[PDB]
Amino acid sequence: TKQYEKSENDLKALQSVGQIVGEVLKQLTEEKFIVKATNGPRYVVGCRRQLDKSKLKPGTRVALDMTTLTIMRYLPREVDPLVYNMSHEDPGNVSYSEIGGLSEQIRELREVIELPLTNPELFQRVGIIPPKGCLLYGPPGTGKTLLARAVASQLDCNFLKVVSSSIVDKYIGESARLIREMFNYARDHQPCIIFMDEIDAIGGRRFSEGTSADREIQRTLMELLNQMDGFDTLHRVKMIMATNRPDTLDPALLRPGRLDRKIHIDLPNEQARLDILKIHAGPITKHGEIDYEAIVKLSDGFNGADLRNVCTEAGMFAIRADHDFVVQEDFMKAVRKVADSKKLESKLDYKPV
């Protein structure tokens, strides 16, 4: 029962008041150390006898006391968006080769990513600069989020994710230090891979500057433009971006450097649609008599999200008939009808609104 006495004595040590944290700036002398608290005041204070030479550091966060503001222990500094960035997930592996097309985009994205990791020798011996970035835009077909994130999730602890909602951040919020942090940790984990999706809102041009909120978009831009075209070495880390249209990217992003390789997604083709139907027919049960050319021919110019989810819509029409294994006749009904209904809903392609 002495564990209670042990537990309460540990809570007696909890009577010790907590301290405050700050960032070291410089040092005037041994008895005065410039430290900037997270609030922004800067103090020059002494120190106690329990610390070492590793406490000083070149501008690293420290914990200031609440009385004399002296430093107790030092800890590594992070603003910690990254743990939130690593909270993503995705199956595959397999989903790499499941899309089926285009075969040239399947093989190339495997090279520019994996080859610099395993074989740097080809770059240094031939004397060529490997691509440090890439651009995958849409939606002329699917595979943007599927193929890129598959290698991401398979690369495990080495990856960086960016959602377009985190750039605006909060009122009078600072995303300029996020752009510098995103590329700072990109230079830590190697090779790092960064995904930026739906940049049309956060890629704001400075031609027409609305209200007070367009400039803070330009600030996040110029922070991206500086480090991607640096002057700061990104050669080992790979970057990826995504957008609906490259209208607002400006000559800065449309240029090479910051955006290196722009690979346009291609819609599924009758030859390639035969492969994507094989992977769709796996999870769904079918009748013993099935023809893959029937579904491929009846559905043309449809994205992979259209084909899959309508093939599940065919299963929802199949459960309307309660049959477990269903012939493709009931499928071709639900596949053609529901898909042709989707075509009269959204205008594009080809006509803009």
The two tokens of residue 211 are 């209200």
Q: Which does 99 bind (CB under 5 to 8 A by kind): other proteins, ligand ATP, none?
A: ligand ATP
* Length reported for the chain: 353
Where do we find the tokens 């996020």? Answer: 178
Shortest approach of other proteins to residue 343 CB, angstroms? 10
Among 175, 304, 313, 335, contact with ligand ATP (rule: CB under 6 A):
304
Question: According to the annotation, is 82 in a ligand binding site?
Answer: no
Tell me 129's DSSP state. Answer: P
Nearer to ligand ATP by C-beta: 81 or 143? Answer: 143
Q: How many CA atoms lie within 13 A of 33 on its CB side?
A: 24
Interaction of residue 145 with ligand ATP, rule CB under 6 A: yes
Window contacting other proteins (CB under 8 A); options: 75-83, 269-277, 286-294, 308-316: 308-316
Shortest approach of ligand ATP to residue 54 CB, angstroms? 47
- 318 CA to centre of own chain: 37
Interaction of residue 142 with ligand ATP, rule CB under 6 A: yes
Interaction of residue 101 with ligand ATP, rule CB under 6 A: no
Omega within 30 of 0 (cis) for the link into 93: yes
Question: According to the annotation, is 143 in a ligand binding site?
Answer: yes
Shortest approach of other proteins to residue 210 CB, angstroms? 4
d(CA 29, CA 26): 9
| Residue pair 307/276 in contact by the 8 Å Cβ criterion | yes
The two tokens of residue 70 are 């002296």
d(CA 7, CA 1): 10
Number of residues that bind ligand ATP (CB under 6 A): 13
- What are the residues whose beta carbons fall under 8 Å from the beta carbon of 263, sequence distance 6 or more? 105, 108, 109, 134, 135, 136
Question: According to the annotation, is 177 in a ligand binding site?
Answer: no
C-alpha to C-alpha distances, 17 to 12, 47, 117, nearest whole angstrom: 11, 18, 48
- 171 CA to centre of own chain: 23
Window contacting other proteins (CB under 8 A); options: 32-40, 73-81, 181-189, 210-218: 210-218
Interaction of residue 311 with ligand ATP, rule CB under 6 A: no
Interaction of residue 149 with other proteins, rule CB under 8 A: yes
Q: Which does 190 bind (CB under 5 to 8 A by kind): ligand ATP, other proteins, none?
A: none
Phi/psi for 348 (5° steps) reads -70, 140
Residue from 256, 172, 258, 247 nearest 222 by CA: 258
C-alpha Rg value of the chain to the nearest Å: 28
Q: Which does 18 bind (CB under 5 to 8 A by kind): ligand ATP, other proteins, none?
A: none
Nearer to other proteins by C-beta: 31 or 349? Answer: 349
Among 41, 59, 256, 301, contact with other proteins (rule: CB under 8 A):
256
The two tokens of residue 51 are 């610390």
Annotated binding site: 98, 100, 141-146, 149, 197-198, 244, 255, 258, 280, 303, 308
Annotated binding site for Mg(2+): 145, 197-198
The contact set with other proteins (CB under 8 A) reads 88-90, 108, 111-112, 115, 125-131, 138-139, 145, 149, 163-165, 168, 197-198, 200-202, 204-205, 207-211, 213-214, 217, 244, 247-248, 255-257, 260-261, 303, 305-306, 308-309, 312-313, 341-342, 344-349, 352-353
